[PDB]
Amino acid sequence: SHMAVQIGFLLFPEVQQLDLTGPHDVLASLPDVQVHLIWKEPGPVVASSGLVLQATTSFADCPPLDVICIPGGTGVGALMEDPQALAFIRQQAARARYVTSVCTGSLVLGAAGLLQGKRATTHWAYHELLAPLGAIPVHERVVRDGNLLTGAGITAGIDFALTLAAELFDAATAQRVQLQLEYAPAPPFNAGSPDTAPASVVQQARQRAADSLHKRREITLRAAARLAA
Amino acid sequence: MAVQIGFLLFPEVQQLDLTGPHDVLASLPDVQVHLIWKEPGPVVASSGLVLQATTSFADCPPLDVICIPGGTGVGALMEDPQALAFIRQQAARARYVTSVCTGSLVLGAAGLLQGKRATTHWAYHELLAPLGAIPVHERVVRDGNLLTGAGITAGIDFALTLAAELFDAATAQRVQLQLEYAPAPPFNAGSPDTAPASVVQQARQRAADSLHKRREITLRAAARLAA
């Protein structure tokens, strides 16, 4: 309807698609919501896995949003230095009811200046990059600070979206959606956190990310310098 | 030599049934993932999210794994002879025949659950028995080379289970850590056993019309298998 809650996800090249599609299916289950997928122009955008998604609106045509949500992925590094994307995020955040992200999407919020003095989380492997952007880093799965909600790595988007559902509506509605999604997880292994995974697995995860971390650290410090000037 | 994994992408799919497993499995080495429909091109999910099929039935390579997601659109598939014949064609040699949520009802309509242990979404579980399955109330059920997952989000648990079977435990653990899949749901309402009674009543009330329509489709599909 024309009174629908307006929810917008930034959809960018090399996004981690589950960061977006998990929350999307949770939030699209709520009453009278309209969901936008936003990029520089409508059309196909290819996720890091090769899955093709479709942006529904441009920055210029996007209506004022009640919720803005930034997913993460390999493509965040480019977004952290994209003045057009950062300007759009800041404009929408001025009036959004909730300003949100999943995984390394919080680094984009940081580059936009929206984490200064705020508690936030991100993917476990990139958590150290929050502090240079002014955030108070919190090692929890879903972190709230006022109208800022941030989720941790990839699959945390589902827990994040159920938390957001309860704030937009109420606990009963969020529970109904949880039941419809049969979200009673039973992972076959206990390796979802660096604290519980086998040490051998964590060490490989850290080394496989080392080059990306060093590159993102330099981008992060450039973005921080632009906030300081 | 790459492992060929195919998902059936159909109109009115529940997209998370597909996109959850897709991001898990596409993270593995030496795999190629296909999104299959009658023709390549856009296919709109039940939420309005637009996905893109990458291959037609005819161009799909022989699959190591076939996976049927669920959603509103399964009712049509259960009486679509082309889709059912394609599924049987690929199941004949696939190493694994699989589904998530109400995708197992499509496997049932194709005749592939006869005498097998299987699960589905909690609200439609009663429809497995008329399709010949032995219904099991577990989140991921394996019977030989058949793996079925329960409702929607069970696809993530299903996909990690499958990853370990295709490769090994260490490979599945690496992917689990990259996905930071250590869930901490904000409520305990993911199962009819644990949700408040008021929430269960509302969820059942909302599913009632779909369940009735699917009771009727299921009995026609079963009668075809019998005749």
Coordinates of C-alpha atoms in Angstrom, one line a residue:
Chain A
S1 CA 0.0 0.0 0.0
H2 CA 0.9 3.7 0.0
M3 CA 1.4 3.6 3.8
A4 CA 3.9 0.7 3.7
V5 CA 7.1 0.7 5.7
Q6 CA 9.9 1.6 3.2
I7 CA 12.9 -0.7 3.6
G8 CA 15.9 -0.3 1.3
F9 CA 19.0 -2.5 0.8
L10 CA 22.1 -1.2 -1.0
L11 CA 22.8 -3.7 -3.8
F12 CA 26.4 -3.3 -5.2
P13 CA 28.8 -5.3 -7.3
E14 CA 30.4 -8.2 -5.5
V15 CA 28.0 -8.1 -2.6
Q16 CA 27.8 -11.2 -0.4
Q17 CA 24.2 -12.1 -1.4
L18 CA 23.1 -13.9 1.8
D19 CA 23.8 -10.7 3.7
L20 CA 20.9 -9.2 1.7
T21 CA 18.7 -12.2 0.8
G22 CA 18.4 -13.5 4.3
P23 CA 17.1 -10.3 5.8
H24 CA 15.0 -9.7 2.7
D25 CA 12.9 -12.8 3.1
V26 CA 12.5 -12.2 6.8
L27 CA 11.4 -8.6 6.4
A28 CA 9.2 -9.2 3.3
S29 CA 7.2 -11.5 5.5
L30 CA 6.0 -8.5 7.6
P31 CA 2.6 -6.7 7.0
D32 CA 2.6 -4.0 4.4
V33 CA 6.3 -3.5 3.8
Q34 CA 7.8 -2.3 0.5
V35 CA 11.4 -3.4 -0.1
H36 CA 13.8 -1.6 -2.5
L37 CA 17.1 -2.8 -3.9
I38 CA 19.1 0.4 -4.5
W39 CA 22.1 1.0 -6.8
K40 CA 23.3 3.8 -9.1
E41 CA 20.8 2.6 -11.8
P42 CA 18.2 -0.2 -11.9
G43 CA 19.3 -3.4 -13.5
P44 CA 21.4 -6.5 -12.9
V45 CA 24.1 -6.6 -10.2
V46 CA 26.3 -9.7 -9.9
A47 CA 27.0 -11.0 -6.4
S48 CA 30.4 -12.4 -5.4
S49 CA 29.2 -15.9 -6.0
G50 CA 27.9 -15.2 -9.5
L51 CA 24.2 -15.0 -8.4
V52 CA 22.6 -12.2 -10.4
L53 CA 20.3 -9.8 -8.5
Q54 CA 18.2 -6.9 -9.8
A55 CA 18.3 -3.4 -8.4
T56 CA 14.8 -1.9 -8.5
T57 CA 15.7 1.8 -8.1
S58 CA 18.4 4.4 -8.5
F59 CA 19.8 6.6 -5.7
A60 CA 18.0 9.5 -7.2
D61 CA 14.5 7.9 -7.4
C62 CA 14.6 6.1 -4.1
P63 CA 11.8 7.3 -1.8
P64 CA 12.7 8.4 1.8
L65 CA 13.4 5.2 3.7
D66 CA 12.2 4.0 7.1
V67 CA 15.0 1.5 7.2
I68 CA 18.3 1.5 5.3
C69 CA 20.4 -1.6 5.4
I70 CA 23.9 -2.1 4.0
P71 CA 25.1 -5.6 3.3
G72 CA 28.7 -6.6 3.1
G73 CA 31.0 -8.5 0.8
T74 CA 34.1 -8.2 -1.3
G75 CA 32.7 -5.1 -2.9
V76 CA 32.6 -3.0 0.3
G77 CA 36.2 -1.8 -0.2
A78 CA 35.1 0.2 -3.3
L79 CA 32.0 1.5 -1.5
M80 CA 34.0 2.9 1.4
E81 CA 35.6 5.4 -1.1
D82 CA 32.5 6.0 -3.3
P83 CA 31.3 9.6 -2.6
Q84 CA 28.0 9.0 -4.4
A85 CA 27.1 6.0 -2.3
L86 CA 28.3 7.6 0.9
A87 CA 26.2 10.8 0.2
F88 CA 23.1 8.7 -0.4
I89 CA 23.6 6.8 2.9
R90 CA 24.1 10.0 4.9
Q91 CA 21.1 11.6 3.3
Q92 CA 18.8 8.6 4.1
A93 CA 20.2 8.1 7.6
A94 CA 19.3 11.7 8.5
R95 CA 15.6 10.7 8.7
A96 CA 15.5 6.9 8.8
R97 CA 13.8 5.2 11.7
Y98 CA 16.6 2.7 11.7
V99 CA 20.1 2.7 10.1
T100 CA 21.4 -0.8 9.8
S101 CA 24.0 -3.2 8.3
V102 CA 25.1 -6.8 8.2
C103 CA 28.6 -8.1 8.2
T104 CA 31.2 -5.8 6.6
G105 CA 28.4 -3.4 5.7
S106 CA 29.1 -1.7 9.0
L107 CA 32.5 -0.6 7.5
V108 CA 30.5 1.4 4.9
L109 CA 28.5 3.0 7.7
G110 CA 31.8 3.8 9.3
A111 CA 33.2 5.4 6.2
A112 CA 30.0 7.5 6.0
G113 CA 30.7 8.8 9.5
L114 CA 27.8 7.1 11.1
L115 CA 29.6 5.0 13.7
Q116 CA 31.5 7.7 15.5
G117 CA 31.1 7.1 19.2
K118 CA 28.6 4.3 18.5
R119 CA 28.6 0.6 19.5
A120 CA 28.8 -1.7 16.5
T121 CA 29.8 -5.1 15.3
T122 CA 30.9 -6.7 12.0
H123 CA 32.3 -10.0 10.7
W124 CA 34.7 -11.6 13.2
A125 CA 37.7 -11.4 10.8
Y126 CA 37.4 -7.7 10.2
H127 CA 36.3 -6.5 13.7
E128 CA 39.6 -4.6 14.3
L129 CA 38.7 -2.1 11.6
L130 CA 35.8 -0.7 13.5
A131 CA 37.8 1.4 16.0
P132 CA 39.7 3.5 13.4
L133 CA 36.2 4.5 12.1
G134 CA 35.3 5.8 15.6
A135 CA 33.1 2.9 16.7
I136 CA 33.1 1.1 20.0
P137 CA 33.7 -2.5 18.9
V138 CA 31.3 -5.0 20.5
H139 CA 31.8 -8.8 20.1
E140 CA 28.1 -9.7 19.9
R141 CA 25.9 -11.0 17.1
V142 CA 23.5 -8.1 16.9
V143 CA 24.4 -4.8 18.4
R144 CA 22.0 -1.9 19.1
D145 CA 22.9 1.7 19.8
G146 CA 19.9 4.0 19.6
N147 CA 18.5 3.6 16.1
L148 CA 21.7 1.9 14.8
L149 CA 21.5 -1.9 14.5
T150 CA 24.5 -3.9 13.2
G151 CA 24.8 -7.6 12.6
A152 CA 27.9 -9.7 12.7
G153 CA 29.2 -11.9 9.9
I154 CA 27.0 -13.2 7.0
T155 CA 24.4 -15.5 8.6
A156 CA 23.9 -13.0 11.4
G157 CA 21.6 -11.2 9.0
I158 CA 18.8 -13.6 10.0
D159 CA 19.2 -12.9 13.7
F160 CA 19.5 -9.2 12.9
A161 CA 16.3 -9.2 10.8
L162 CA 14.2 -10.9 13.5
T163 CA 15.5 -8.4 16.0
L164 CA 14.6 -5.5 13.7
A165 CA 11.2 -7.1 13.0
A166 CA 10.3 -6.9 16.7
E167 CA 11.3 -3.2 16.8
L168 CA 9.2 -2.3 13.8
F169 CA 6.2 -4.3 14.9
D170 CA 6.3 -6.3 18.2
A171 CA 7.7 -9.5 19.6
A172 CA 4.6 -11.6 18.7
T173 CA 4.9 -10.7 15.0
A174 CA 8.7 -11.5 15.0
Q175 CA 8.0 -14.8 16.7
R176 CA 5.3 -15.7 14.1
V177 CA 7.8 -15.0 11.3
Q178 CA 10.5 -17.1 13.2
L179 CA 8.0 -20.0 13.3
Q180 CA 7.0 -19.6 9.6
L181 CA 10.7 -19.7 8.8
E182 CA 11.2 -22.8 11.1
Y183 CA 14.2 -21.0 12.4
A184 CA 15.3 -23.4 15.2
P185 CA 18.9 -23.9 13.9
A186 CA 20.8 -27.2 14.5
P187 CA 24.2 -26.7 12.9
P188 CA 26.0 -30.0 12.1
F189 CA 29.3 -28.6 13.4
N190 CA 30.3 -26.1 16.1
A191 CA 32.7 -24.0 14.0
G192 CA 30.7 -20.8 13.5
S193 CA 32.8 -18.7 15.8
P194 CA 36.6 -18.4 16.1
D195 CA 36.1 -19.2 19.8
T196 CA 34.6 -22.6 19.1
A197 CA 36.0 -23.7 15.8
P198 CA 39.0 -26.0 15.8
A199 CA 42.2 -24.0 16.1
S200 CA 43.5 -25.3 12.8
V201 CA 40.4 -24.0 11.1
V202 CA 40.7 -20.5 12.6
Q203 CA 44.3 -20.2 11.6
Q204 CA 43.5 -21.0 8.0
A205 CA 40.6 -18.6 8.1
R206 CA 42.9 -15.8 9.4
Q207 CA 45.7 -16.5 6.8
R208 CA 43.2 -16.7 3.9
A209 CA 41.9 -13.3 4.9
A210 CA 45.3 -11.7 5.6
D211 CA 45.8 -10.0 2.2
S212 CA 42.2 -8.6 2.2
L213 CA 42.7 -7.3 5.8
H214 CA 45.8 -5.4 4.9
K215 CA 44.2 -3.9 1.8
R216 CA 41.0 -3.0 3.8
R217 CA 43.1 -1.5 6.6
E218 CA 44.6 1.0 4.2
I219 CA 41.2 1.9 2.7
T220 CA 39.9 2.2 6.3
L221 CA 42.6 4.7 7.3
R222 CA 42.0 6.8 4.1
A223 CA 38.3 6.9 4.9
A224 CA 39.0 7.9 8.5
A225 CA 41.2 10.7 7.2
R226 CA 38.4 12.1 5.1
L227 CA 36.2 12.2 8.2
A228 CA 38.9 14.0 10.1
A229 CA 39.2 16.8 7.5
Chain B
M1 CA 35.5 -33.1 -12.7
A2 CA 34.0 -30.1 -11.0
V3 CA 31.0 -31.0 -8.8
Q4 CA 27.8 -29.9 -10.7
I5 CA 25.1 -28.6 -8.3
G6 CA 21.7 -27.6 -9.7
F7 CA 18.8 -25.8 -8.0
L8 CA 15.4 -25.8 -9.6
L9 CA 14.3 -22.1 -9.8
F10 CA 10.6 -21.7 -10.3
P11 CA 8.0 -18.9 -10.2
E12 CA 6.9 -18.1 -6.6
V13 CA 9.9 -19.9 -5.0
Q14 CA 10.7 -19.1 -1.4
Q15 CA 14.0 -17.5 -2.3
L16 CA 15.8 -18.2 1.0
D17 CA 15.3 -21.9 0.5
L18 CA 17.6 -21.5 -2.5
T19 CA 19.9 -18.6 -1.7
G20 CA 20.9 -19.9 1.7
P21 CA 22.2 -23.2 0.4
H22 CA 23.6 -21.4 -2.7
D23 CA 25.9 -19.2 -0.8
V24 CA 27.1 -22.1 1.4
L25 CA 27.8 -24.5 -1.6
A26 CA 29.2 -21.9 -4.0
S27 CA 31.9 -21.3 -1.3
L28 CA 33.3 -24.8 -2.0
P29 CA 36.3 -25.6 -4.3
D30 CA 35.7 -27.3 -7.6
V31 CA 32.0 -26.7 -7.8
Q32 CA 29.7 -25.2 -10.4
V33 CA 26.2 -24.1 -9.4
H34 CA 23.3 -23.9 -11.9
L35 CA 19.9 -22.3 -11.5
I36 CA 17.6 -24.3 -13.7
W37 CA 14.2 -23.4 -15.2
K38 CA 12.4 -24.1 -18.5
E39 CA 14.3 -21.2 -20.1
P40 CA 17.1 -18.9 -18.8
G41 CA 16.1 -15.5 -17.7
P42 CA 14.2 -13.8 -14.8
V43 CA 12.2 -15.8 -12.4
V44 CA 10.3 -13.9 -9.7
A45 CA 10.3 -15.3 -6.1
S46 CA 7.2 -15.1 -3.8
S47 CA 8.5 -11.9 -2.2
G48 CA 9.0 -10.1 -5.5
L49 CA 12.8 -10.6 -5.5
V50 CA 13.9 -11.3 -9.1
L51 CA 16.4 -14.1 -9.6
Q52 CA 17.9 -15.3 -12.9
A53 CA 17.9 -18.8 -14.2
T54 CA 21.2 -19.7 -15.8
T55 CA 20.2 -22.7 -17.9
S56 CA 17.2 -24.4 -19.5
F57 CA 16.4 -28.0 -18.8
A58 CA 18.0 -29.0 -22.1
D59 CA 21.3 -27.2 -21.5
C60 CA 21.7 -28.4 -17.9
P61 CA 24.8 -30.6 -17.5
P62 CA 24.4 -34.0 -15.8
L63 CA 24.2 -33.1 -12.1
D64 CA 26.0 -34.5 -9.1
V65 CA 23.5 -32.8 -6.8
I66 CA 19.9 -31.7 -7.6
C67 CA 18.1 -29.5 -5.1
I68 CA 14.5 -28.6 -5.1
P69 CA 13.5 -25.5 -3.0
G70 CA 10.0 -24.9 -1.7
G71 CA 7.5 -22.0 -1.7
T72 CA 4.1 -21.0 -2.9
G73 CA 5.0 -22.2 -6.4
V74 CA 5.4 -25.9 -5.5
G75 CA 1.7 -26.6 -6.0
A76 CA 2.0 -25.9 -9.7
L77 CA 5.1 -28.0 -10.0
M78 CA 3.4 -31.0 -8.3
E79 CA 1.2 -31.3 -11.4
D80 CA 3.7 -30.2 -14.1
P81 CA 4.7 -33.2 -16.1
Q82 CA 7.7 -31.5 -17.7
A83 CA 9.2 -30.5 -14.4
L84 CA 8.5 -33.9 -12.8
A85 CA 10.0 -35.7 -15.8
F86 CA 13.1 -33.4 -15.7
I87 CA 13.6 -34.1 -12.0
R88 CA 13.3 -37.9 -12.6
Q89 CA 15.8 -37.6 -15.5
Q90 CA 18.4 -35.9 -13.2
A91 CA 17.7 -38.1 -10.2
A92 CA 18.4 -41.2 -12.1
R93 CA 22.2 -40.6 -12.0
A94 CA 22.7 -37.8 -9.5
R95 CA 24.9 -38.6 -6.6
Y96 CA 22.4 -36.8 -4.3
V97 CA 18.8 -36.0 -4.8
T98 CA 17.8 -33.3 -2.3
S99 CA 15.3 -30.7 -1.3
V100 CA 14.5 -28.0 1.3
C101 CA 11.2 -27.2 2.9
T102 CA 8.2 -28.0 0.7
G103 CA 10.5 -28.9 -2.1
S104 CA 10.2 -32.5 -0.8
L105 CA 6.5 -32.4 -1.8
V106 CA 7.8 -32.0 -5.4
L107 CA 10.1 -35.0 -5.0
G108 CA 7.1 -36.8 -3.6
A109 CA 4.9 -35.9 -6.6
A110 CA 7.7 -37.2 -8.9
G111 CA 7.6 -40.6 -7.1
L112 CA 11.0 -40.2 -5.4
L113 CA 9.9 -40.5 -1.8
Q114 CA 8.3 -43.9 -2.0
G115 CA 9.4 -45.9 1.0
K116 CA 12.0 -43.3 2.1
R117 CA 12.5 -41.4 5.3
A118 CA 11.9 -37.7 4.7
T119 CA 10.9 -34.4 6.2
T120 CA 9.4 -31.0 5.2
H121 CA 8.1 -27.8 6.7
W122 CA 6.4 -28.4 10.0
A123 CA 3.0 -27.0 8.8
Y124 CA 2.8 -29.3 5.8
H125 CA 4.4 -32.5 7.3
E126 CA 1.1 -34.4 7.1
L127 CA 1.4 -34.4 3.3
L128 CA 4.5 -36.7 3.2
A129 CA 2.7 -39.9 4.0
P130 CA 0.2 -39.8 1.1
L131 CA 3.2 -39.4 -1.2
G132 CA 4.7 -42.6 0.1
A133 CA 7.3 -41.2 2.5
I134 CA 8.1 -42.4 6.0
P135 CA 7.7 -39.0 7.8
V136 CA 10.5 -38.1 10.2
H137 CA 10.4 -35.1 12.5
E138 CA 14.0 -34.1 12.2
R139 CA 15.6 -31.0 10.6
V140 CA 17.8 -32.8 8.1
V141 CA 16.9 -36.4 7.1
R142 CA 19.2 -38.7 5.1
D143 CA 18.0 -41.9 3.5
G144 CA 20.6 -43.3 1.1
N145 CA 21.4 -40.6 -1.4
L146 CA 18.2 -38.6 -0.5
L147 CA 18.7 -35.6 1.8
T148 CA 15.7 -33.5 2.8
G149 CA 15.7 -30.4 5.0
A150 CA 12.8 -29.0 7.0
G151 CA 11.3 -25.6 6.7
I152 CA 13.0 -22.6 5.1
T153 CA 16.0 -21.8 7.2
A154 CA 16.8 -25.5 7.6
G155 CA 18.4 -25.0 4.2
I156 CA 21.5 -23.7 5.9
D157 CA 21.9 -26.7 8.1
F158 CA 21.1 -29.0 5.2
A159 CA 23.8 -27.4 3.0
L160 CA 26.5 -27.7 5.7
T161 CA 25.5 -31.4 6.1
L162 CA 25.8 -31.9 2.3
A163 CA 29.1 -30.0 2.1
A164 CA 30.7 -32.5 4.5
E165 CA 29.4 -35.4 2.5
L166 CA 30.7 -34.0 -0.8
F167 CA 34.1 -33.1 0.8
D168 CA 34.8 -33.6 4.5
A169 CA 34.2 -32.2 7.9
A170 CA 37.1 -29.7 7.9
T171 CA 35.9 -28.2 4.6
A172 CA 32.4 -27.8 6.1
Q173 CA 33.8 -26.2 9.2
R174 CA 35.8 -23.7 7.2
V175 CA 32.7 -22.6 5.4
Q176 CA 30.7 -22.4 8.6
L177 CA 33.4 -20.1 10.1
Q178 CA 33.5 -17.9 7.0
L179 CA 29.7 -17.6 7.3
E180 CA 29.9 -16.9 11.0
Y181 CA 27.1 -19.5 11.4
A182 CA 26.9 -19.5 15.2
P183 CA 23.2 -18.6 15.4
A184 CA 21.7 -16.7 18.4
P185 CA 18.0 -16.3 17.6
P186 CA 16.4 -13.4 19.6
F187 CA 13.3 -15.7 20.4
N188 CA 12.7 -19.4 20.9
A189 CA 9.7 -19.7 18.5
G190 CA 11.3 -21.6 15.6
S191 CA 9.4 -24.8 16.3
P192 CA 5.8 -25.6 17.2
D193 CA 7.2 -27.4 20.2
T194 CA 8.8 -24.3 21.7
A195 CA 6.8 -21.3 20.4
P196 CA 4.1 -19.8 22.5
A197 CA 0.7 -21.4 22.0
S198 CA -0.7 -18.1 20.7
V199 CA 2.0 -17.9 18.0
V200 CA 1.4 -21.4 16.9
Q201 CA -2.3 -20.7 16.5
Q202 CA -1.6 -17.7 14.4
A203 CA 0.9 -19.5 12.2
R204 CA -1.5 -22.4 11.7
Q205 CA -4.4 -20.0 10.9
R206 CA -2.3 -18.3 8.2
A207 CA -1.2 -21.5 6.6
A208 CA -4.7 -23.1 6.6
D209 CA -5.8 -22.1 3.1
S210 CA -2.5 -23.2 1.5
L211 CA -2.6 -26.5 3.4
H212 CA -6.2 -27.2 2.2
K213 CA -5.3 -26.5 -1.4
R214 CA -2.1 -28.6 -1.1
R215 CA -4.1 -31.5 0.5
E216 CA -6.1 -31.6 -2.8
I217 CA -3.1 -31.4 -5.1
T218 CA -1.3 -34.0 -3.1
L219 CA -4.1 -36.6 -3.4
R220 CA -4.3 -36.1 -7.2
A221 CA -0.5 -36.5 -7.4
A222 CA -0.6 -39.6 -5.4
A223 CA -3.5 -41.1 -7.4
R224 CA -1.3 -40.6 -10.6
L225 CA 1.6 -42.5 -9.0
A226 CA -0.8 -45.3 -8.2
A227 CA -2.5 -45.6 -11.6

